[PDB]
């Protein structure tokens, strides 16, 4: 029981990526309506992915996680 070697963090995952070895099974062709949430989710998820620095230069700090509630 000694520290004799280290592992990289990539391996020893709980579960591997489920977005490159799997691909979503639903697209925005199921989405017609639900546009009200669509303006809020393209701000929340997509904008930090395409570029995080958009927020930073304006001087708005980024929003955190997303909670979806409802039946």
């Amino acid at each position: 029981n000694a520290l004799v070697d280290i592992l990289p963090p990539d391996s020893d995952s709980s579960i591997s990526v489920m977005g490159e070895n799997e691909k979503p099974d639903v697209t925005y062709a199921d989405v017609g309506g639900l546009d009200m949430q669509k303006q809020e989710i393209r701000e929340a998820v997509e904008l930090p992915l395409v570029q995080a620095d958009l927020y930073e230069q304006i001087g708005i700090d980024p929003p955190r996680g997303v909670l979806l509630y409802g039946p």
Binding site: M18, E22, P24, D25, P71
Partner: protein, 87 residues
């Protein structure tokens, strides 16, 4: 979880839940710890029923003796698409 797995190697499977009122319970957990035990097991079902895990040749037949006991997320269509009553 592992019962659904069985269902995907075995052909056209049919899952009969018999007389379910046990985990039919609602959110409660102001009572005893048993009500969160129900909760843990219930969340497990939803992720299976709909998600990236989708069925098609795995079918659910759910048998109950009163359906207004249940939680309404177990009354949810497209997991339960037909609601057949036998009078």
């Amino acid at each position: 979880r592992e019962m659904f797995a069985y269902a995907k190697e075995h052909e056209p499977c049919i899952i009969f839940m018999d007389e379910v009122d046990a985990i039919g319970g609602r959110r409660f957990s102001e009572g005893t710890s048993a009500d969160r035990e129900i909760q843990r097991t219930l969340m497990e079902l939803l992720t299976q029923m709909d998600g990236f895990d989708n069925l098609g040749q795995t079918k659910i037949i759910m048998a109950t003796n009163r359906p207004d006991t249940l939680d309404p997320a177990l009354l949810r269509p497209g997991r339960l698409d037909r609601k057949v009553e036998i009078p």
